[PDB]
Amino acid sequence: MVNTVNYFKQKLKTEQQIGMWVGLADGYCAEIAANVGYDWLLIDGEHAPNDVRSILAQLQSIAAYPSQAVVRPVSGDVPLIKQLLDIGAQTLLIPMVESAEQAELMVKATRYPPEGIRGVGAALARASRWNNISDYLQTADEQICLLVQVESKKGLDNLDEILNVDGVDGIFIGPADLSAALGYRGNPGHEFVQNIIVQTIQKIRAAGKAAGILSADEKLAKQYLELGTEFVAVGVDTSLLMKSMKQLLSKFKN
Amino acid sequence: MVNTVNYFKQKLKTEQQIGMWVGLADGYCAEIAANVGYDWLLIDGEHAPNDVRSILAQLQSIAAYPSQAVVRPVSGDVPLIKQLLDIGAQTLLIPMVESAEQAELMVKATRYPPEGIRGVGAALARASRWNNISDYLQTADEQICLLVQVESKKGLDNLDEILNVDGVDGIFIGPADLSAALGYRGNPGHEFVQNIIVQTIQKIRAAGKAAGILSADEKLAKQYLELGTEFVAVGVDTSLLMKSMKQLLSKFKN
Amino acid sequence: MVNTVNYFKQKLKTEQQIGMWVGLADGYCAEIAANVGYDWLLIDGEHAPNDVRSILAQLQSIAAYPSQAVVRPVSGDVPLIKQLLDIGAQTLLIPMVESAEQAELMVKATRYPPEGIRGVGAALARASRWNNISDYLQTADEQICLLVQVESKKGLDNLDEILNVDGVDGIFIGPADLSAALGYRGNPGHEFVQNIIVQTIQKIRAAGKAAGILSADEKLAKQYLELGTEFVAVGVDTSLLMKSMKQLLSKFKN
Amino acid sequence: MVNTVNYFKQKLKTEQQIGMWVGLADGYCAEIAANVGYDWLLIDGEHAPNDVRSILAQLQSIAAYPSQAVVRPVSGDVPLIKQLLDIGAQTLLIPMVESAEQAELMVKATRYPPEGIRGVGAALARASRWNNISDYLQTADEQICLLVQVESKKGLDNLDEILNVDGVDGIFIGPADLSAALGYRGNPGHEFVQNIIVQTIQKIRAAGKAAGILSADEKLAKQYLELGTEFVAVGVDTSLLMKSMKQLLSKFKN
Amino acid sequence: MVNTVNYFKQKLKTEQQIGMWVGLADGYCAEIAANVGYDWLLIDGEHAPNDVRSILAQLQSIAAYPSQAVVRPVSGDVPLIKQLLDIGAQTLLIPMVESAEQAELMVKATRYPPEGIRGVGAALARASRWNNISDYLQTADEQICLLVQVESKKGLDNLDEILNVDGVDGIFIGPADLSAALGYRGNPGHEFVQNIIVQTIQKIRAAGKAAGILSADEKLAKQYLELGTEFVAVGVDTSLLMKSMKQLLSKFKN
Amino acid sequence: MVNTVNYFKQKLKTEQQIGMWVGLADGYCAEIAANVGYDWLLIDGEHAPNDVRSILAQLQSIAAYPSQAVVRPVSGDVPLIKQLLDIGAQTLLIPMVESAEQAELMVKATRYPPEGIRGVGAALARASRWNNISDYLQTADEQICLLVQVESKKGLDNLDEILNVDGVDGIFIGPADLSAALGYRGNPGHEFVQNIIVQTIQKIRAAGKAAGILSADEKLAKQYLELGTEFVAVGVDTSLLMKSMKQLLSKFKN
Ligand SMILES: [Ca+2]
Ligand SMILES: [Ca+2]
Ligand SMILES: [Zn+2]
Ligand SMILES: [Zn+2]
Ligand SMILES: [Zn+2]
Ligand SMILES: [Zn+2]
Ligand SMILES: [Zn+2]
Ligand SMILES: [Zn+2]
């Protein structure tokens, strides 16, 4: 067998990829999302009740479908990154990255020694298909994609420095965490926040990195796509489930 | 503690109850549905991948919310009905009931001896809260609601007989199974099917029983409500999740 | 490896075995019960939310301890009996046995062809330790113990006939189901019920079968032991958990 | 989306398919087996500790790989067949089929009304991808494959009659159950059993049906392939795991 | 919907709350404990085999009952605190707090930016009911209660400093960890330990914070209540299960 | 009950122990491995998808068999070590230990205060059998075995210092991580690597500590045993499953 090609990583340079947030934390729900035709699915280990084993079930579900899986760990924890790479997550979104030093550590966390600090256990890993991918340890690093979140004042204070880190493929802006950090909690739509987001996207693309964002607002998501943003998540499964059920009930009952 | 009042059963005589089908087969998804404010939630053990233990998790989720739980077993199996009553399901929807004899057996399956054949294990049952409901074995039968599905030609051939069975609280029409039985598989909207559904609802209500149905078609659901149908399910969680995600993607990609 | 000796089965002829009902339906709770030193533990598949897989977890827990596991299936279902034997349950308690014909079918359900109808899959079975017990298909039947419940009027109406069935090792009286069948639901302590229970125990032992019963009443359990009853369950884990927590809270408030 | 083509069903007429028995009862173990390149994988619900939900997890695992999934239910139970078809199992192996009447009922159990008795719930089914396969209810029946086991004297007594049932695609011989039924329990290699197996394979192929069998004996499996047997399972995952670990330990320790 | 009122937090200033430790690590066991009527239930993520997902199941169980849930994480880990708040834990008990600097970090970990560092993901959180609590990001912080454990010499060495931290609602004394730290492991009943516990409770209440403790000794628990201790846990579910089963068996054998 | 004797720890001084890596991450697969007769089984929490709860299930499986369980946590995390000790793991293998200071911290993490920093919760712990081991807090430390991995250049740079740490019972060499650290990723068989491994084993034994290693290469494993290496793992369950299934298929298909 040949290593699974990371099409998400390749497409960061060739097209704009439309994403769905997956927080229903279940292999059955993830499979429903995988049937829709999103370019990417974010399996959220930070803000949904997921662990390594529930994330594996969702990778196994999504694997039969063209949608590319991206996993967000709860934090930039090097041992947890090791675990998520070994179950076969090829794209990671690291929350709350705030320095070049932390971004460089996240690069090393995704690469085998001697250049990186990714722990070696290919005989045990779904990532290598338990060594049925016979050249895994030489081909693995090429198909790993590292995305970091800038979503704090300290992150913005270190943006130029993070954008200079080789091996950071993309910077994702987190509008909920960023608007809260800026004193606009629950109000990312404010001009003060939006002006910072737009300038940040422009800086990311000017440094030759992919820019990413989530907005469940159709008009903001389309504006971000017009700016050239490479990976845009346009909704959240928990939100779509709750809203569709509320909208339906409102046709019959107040 | 006093036995949990079955408000669904009481409301069969006083109002029209709006329902949501729950086929996502998970405690977390059931809790999302419970937050919307449906009169009833149908936990589907027939057409969703549920078992006694996954149904218990969903009863526990939904129990904190005013929505009334109804459980559909995979078939009119007396031992499975015993299990679903003991985990605390107070309303059951039995699929594919086709005779007065089968409906009578379903009544006995829901009632303690000596009148019925419900197995007795109150010390072990969530239904009795492990005997913290101190009079459970005396008060249980009063709060149990039995619904049967008529959804085959043999069911329609025994309708008057089923409507004469004391202890059947409601007859639910299954349009998917019934349209297939009638040779209109996937097309319940045909006049031949709809004329049979309407006369069936009229006969059910004329015999003083509650009539029920599911339609994800808003216009058909409202027409059934205009006929006086007592329990109308208006949608399905799996369908609402798939459709909302597809509708969203279509704003950005073909 | 040699087949696991069924000590419960041997002790039916040599001592009186004290039992605990296990309805907490979890491997961790079953292990706590296994540490106490009961002669037997009844893993309840009838009145607790258990399935084959949760029953397997509890057999694996209990296997490291001297307590002997007995499994109660939800009914005398031949395919379910096959499944419970293959995960390695050596003693089964079949509920609601009501005829010699049903008791004979339960005997065949526990024995390999050509004498019985137990399905053969030793390569897959924990029962054979996946054929690490090399003579399993020759030695299995010897260590299987079949107990049947008499707990209905029809059961009592066929008692002499059931007691004549070779391969029935023991008859267990179910006081909750029997008192309900007799029109004393929730009141097994009535003299009318107790006189029937005592005569039934006497008839079972006079036919050379083991008699069994459950009573959470210390005085009745001790009377049943005085009669020579071979397997007496003296409590239920769910009841002991609820009662101990209530008794503790009562020291500090209402 | 178009319905998933059943390549296993097509290949019954074009080639000999090599199979692996999957009894490790887990989505992670099933994925390991799916990586090897077997033509088919038998997910065993009869002799491994599987239920509908654990079988779904294994279908989701195997779905990303070319290996074709076949599911064996615990028995020819029509409601359980409904459940396994709705989670998306396209090929079923029914154990212990003993008459044309039972085989015809198994055909109806796999087909929608009005010709069959398969329950209709396409909005909820992984089988229809929750109606993302838009013509599922008209295209489903064509991709369903029904296999029945002949593995008892009564089965052999009704072989000509079962081979005349339209909609039975294949007859699988179960050597463990059959050798036990013939009084050769644990000894299927006896000439008396082997002569019956060979004649049975010849009769199955002479009636224009696919013949199938399992043998972990390489020489018998190759003899069955030389006879033209269309679907041959050549091993069992639990057996291969136990034997490989024993063989390795024997190199170091007695 | 309005945010769930934290009654435990309110009652720290108005009454003495009686608590039960929940370490059976299961939604079904947590529901049994929720039926008893304790003021609070401690779901133990430190000393019971719990994770975020098992803690969510127990919050869902307990949510239908008046008992208030308190969650103990394994350590004062900021990302784990984020996860437990988002699944809807409103009261946290942080083990082994040893400085005002650590206590201040725990305060920030429970509060949204810009004042705190709690990660923002309200669309995904059971805590916001997936934004069905429409003002959650404005009202959340008010209903969060932070308790810290002092249970080491360094903790006692920083007690006055921790008691000066705004946002610490309560200090819980851990007698097992503290008696071990003091060189009286397994013997918290020693006068040297008890005199330190009593002075600590007095200092906590003198600084206007709630004091808490666990003792399964009725006499010590009642003495702590006489001192005015605001939150007293009086037992542990695992201990009550083991002890009740042992006490019962002792009536019938050694 | 008396504390469970750690025979693995005792045998470090008396024999050479043969081990199997267990990475199938399931109680059922662990039980299969437990039946073979390995001296020790390594439950891998670092490179297999395990968590505290899945590791508990595997300890419960393995506990009925003479094989000794060793648990590898994902990292030298003090709170995770606390959790794994409380579920009853008596031998721990800590990955990537790189200094005497870290090794000393790992010793304290495994010992109760006042000498160590192991959190005290014996009423809740399977390790104490919920205090059914009445002297657990006095006898626990004696039966705990700490193994550390040296598998990086920094580890080798601090080897003499680590070998001087009292309470380190054994040093395990990780050839996959070490060969990668040395610039021979996927090629531990190189003379440069093997000469370092051999001198490392010699230094470990010269300092009176047990030496350990894993090699799935029979010739290297036997050479390590000839050097006197005290604990040698000779294979990996995932590898043996994949290889045995591939070897079997190759007899029938290319
Ligand atoms: Ca199950
Ligand atoms: Ca978990
Ligand atoms: Zn964020
Ligand atoms: Zn229907
Ligand atoms: Zn009974
Ligand atoms: Zn068979
Ligand atoms: Zn403590
Ligand atoms: Zn390593």
Catalytic residue among B7, B27, B47, B198: B47
Q: What is the dihedral of CA D234, D236, D242, D243, to 10 degrees?
A: -10
Partner residue opposite C35 with nearest CB, options F32, F56, F129: F129
Which chain B residue lies closest to D117 (C-alpha atoms)? B181
Note the ligand closest to the C-alpha atom of E56. 2
Cβ-based contacts of C1 with chain F (< 8 Å): 35
Q: Is some CB atom of chain D closer than 8 A to the CB atom of C83?
A: yes
Domain carrying residue E82: 1-254
Which chain A residue lies closest to D63 (C-alpha atoms)? A64
Partner residue opposite B236 with nearest CB, options D56, D124, D137: D124
Partner-chain contact E112 A180, CB within 8 Å: yes
Which chain F residue lies closest to C64 (C-alpha atoms)? F64
> How far apart (Å, rounded) are the C-alpha atoms in residues F213 and F220?
10
Cross-strand partners of E149: E172
- Cα end-to-end distance, chain D, whole Å: 57
> How far apart (Å, rounded) are the C-alpha atoms in residues F154 and F103?
13
Which chain A residue lies closest to F95 (C-alpha atoms)? A119
CA–centroid distance, residue D151 to ligand 6 (Å):
6
Q: How many Å lie between the alpha carbon of A188 and the closest alpha carbon of chain B?
A: 21
Q: Exposed e or buried b for every residue in D47-65, given b needs 16+ CB within 10 A? A: bbbbbbbbbbbbbbbbbbb
For the annotated catalytic residues of D, the residue numbers are 47
Q: Is some CB atom of chain C closer than 8 A to the CB atom of B113?
A: yes
> Is C174 in a helix, a strand, or coil?
coil
How far is CA B151 from its chain centroid? 13
DSSP letter (8 states) at residue E252: T
* H helix or E strand, kind and range, residue E43: strand E40-44
Q: How many Å lie between the alpha carbon of C240 and the closest alpha carbon of chain E?
A: 6
F34, A73 contact by CB (below 8 A): no
D194, D186 contact by CB (below 8 A): no
Partner-chain contact A132 D35, CB within 8 Å: yes
> How far apart (Å, rounded) are the C-alpha atoms in residues B230 and B233?
10
Separate counts of helices (H) and strands (E) for chain C: 12, 8
Q: What experiment produced this structure?
A: X-ray
Number of domains present in the structure of chain F: 1
How far is CA F162 from its chain centroid? 17
Cross-strand partners of B19: B40, B233
Q: Is some CB atom of chain E closer than 8 A to the CB atom of F140?
A: no
Which chain B residue lies closest to E61 (C-alpha atoms)? B60
DSSP letter (8 states) at residue A134: T
D81, D110 contact by CB (below 8 A): yes
Partner residue opposite C130 with nearest CB, options D25, D75, D239: D239
Catalytic residue among C47, C126, C203, C205: C47
Partner-chain contact E114 A49, CB within 8 Å: no
Which chain C residue lies closest to B132 (C-alpha atoms)? C242
Tokens describing residue D33: 């087996």
> How far apart (Å, rounded) are the C-alpha atoms in residues A62 and A43?
10
Partner-chain contact C242 E38, CB within 8 Å: no
Cβ-based contacts of C114 with chain D (< 8 Å): 180-183, 185
Partner-chain contact D249 F49, CB within 8 Å: no
Cα separations (Å) of E110 from A74, A150, C200, E69, E103? 16, 21, 64, 16, 11
Cβ-based contacts of F57 with chain C (< 8 Å): 27, 57, 60
CA–centroid distance, residue C96 to ligand 5 (Å):
7
> How far apart (Å, rounded) are the C-alpha atoms in residues C43 and C253?
34
DSSP letter (8 states) at residue F4: P
Q: How many Å lie between the alpha carbon of D107 and the closest alpha carbon of chain B?
A: 16
Q: Is some CB atom of chain C closer than 8 A to the CB atom of F87?
A: no
C-alpha dihedral sign at E214, E217, E223, E225 = positive
CA-based nearest residue to A249, from B66, E132, B233, D130:
B233
From the CB coordinates, do chains C and D have 3 or more pairs under 8 Å? Answer: yes
> How far apart (Å, rounded) are the C-alpha atoms in residues F233 and E245?
41
> How far apart (Å, rounded) are the C-alpha atoms in residues E44 and E89?
12
In sequence order, which ranges of chain D are alpha helices (DSSP H)? 7-11, 27-34, 52-62, 78-86, 100-109, 136-139, 153-157, 159-162, 175-181, 191-206, 218-226, 237-250
Angle at B33 between CA B30 and CA B34, to 5 degrees: 85
Partner-chain contact B176 D122, CB within 8 Å: yes
E43, E72 contact by CB (below 8 A): yes
Q: Is some CB atom of chain E closer than 8 A to the CB atom of C253?
A: yes
Q: Is some CB atom of chain B closer than 8 A to the CB atom of C185?
A: yes
Q: Is some CB atom of chain D closer than 8 A to the CB atom of F219?
A: no
What would the DSSP string read from start to end of F58-127? HHHHHTTSSSEEEEE-SS--HHHHHHHHHTT--EEEES----HHHHHHHHHHTS-TTTS-----GGG-TT
CA–centroid distance, residue D186 to ligand 6 (Å):
12
Q: How many Å lie between the alpha carbon of B96 and the closest alpha carbon of chain C?
A: 22
Partner-chain contact D87 B49, CB within 8 Å: yes
CA–centroid distance, residue F78 to ligand 7 (Å):
14
Give the best residue of C32, C60, C132 to mutate against chain F (max F CB count within 10 A).
C60
Neighbours of B198 (CB within 10 A): 15
> How far apart (Å, rounded) are the C-alpha atoms in residues A49 and A61?
17
Q: Is some CB atom of chain C closer than 8 A to the CB atom of E245?
A: yes
Cβ-based contacts of E239 with chain C (< 8 Å): none
Q: Is the peptide bond before D79 cis (omega within 30 degrees of 0)?
A: no
Cα separations (Å) of A7 from A13, B252, E78? 11, 19, 34
Partner-chain contact F82 E182, CB within 8 Å: no
Tokens describing residue C17: 């075995």
Cross-strand partners of F148: F94, F171
Note the ligand closest to the C-alpha atom of C122. 6
Q: How many Å lie between the alpha carbon of B135 and the closest alpha carbon of chain D?
A: 36
Q: Which residues contact D187 (CB under 8 A, 6 or more apart)?
A: D179, D193
DSSP letter (8 states) at residue A229: -
Q: Is some CB atom of chain E closer than 8 A to the CB atom of B61?
A: yes
Q: Angle of helix E52-62 relative to helix B52-62, nearest 10 degrees?
A: 60
> Is C239 in a helix, a strand, or coil?
helix
Q: Is some CB atom of chain A closer than 8 A to the CB atom of B26?
A: yes
CA–centroid distance, residue F31 to ligand 8 (Å):
24
CA–centroid distance, residue E188 to ligand 7 (Å):
12
> How far apart (Å, rounded) are the C-alpha atoms in residues F198 and F223?
10
CA–centroid distance, residue C156 to ligand 5 (Å):
14
> How far apart (Å, rounded) are the C-alpha atoms in residues D87 and B23?
12
Q: How many Å lie between the alpha carbon of C64 and the closest alpha carbon of chain F?
A: 4
Q: How many Å lie between the alpha carbon of A41 and the closest alpha carbon of chain F?
A: 21
User: What resolution in angstroms does the PDB record give?
Assistant: 1.9
Give the best residue of A31, A58, A124 to mutate against chain D (max D CB count within 10 A).
A31
Cβ-based contacts of A237 with chain B (< 8 Å): 241, 245
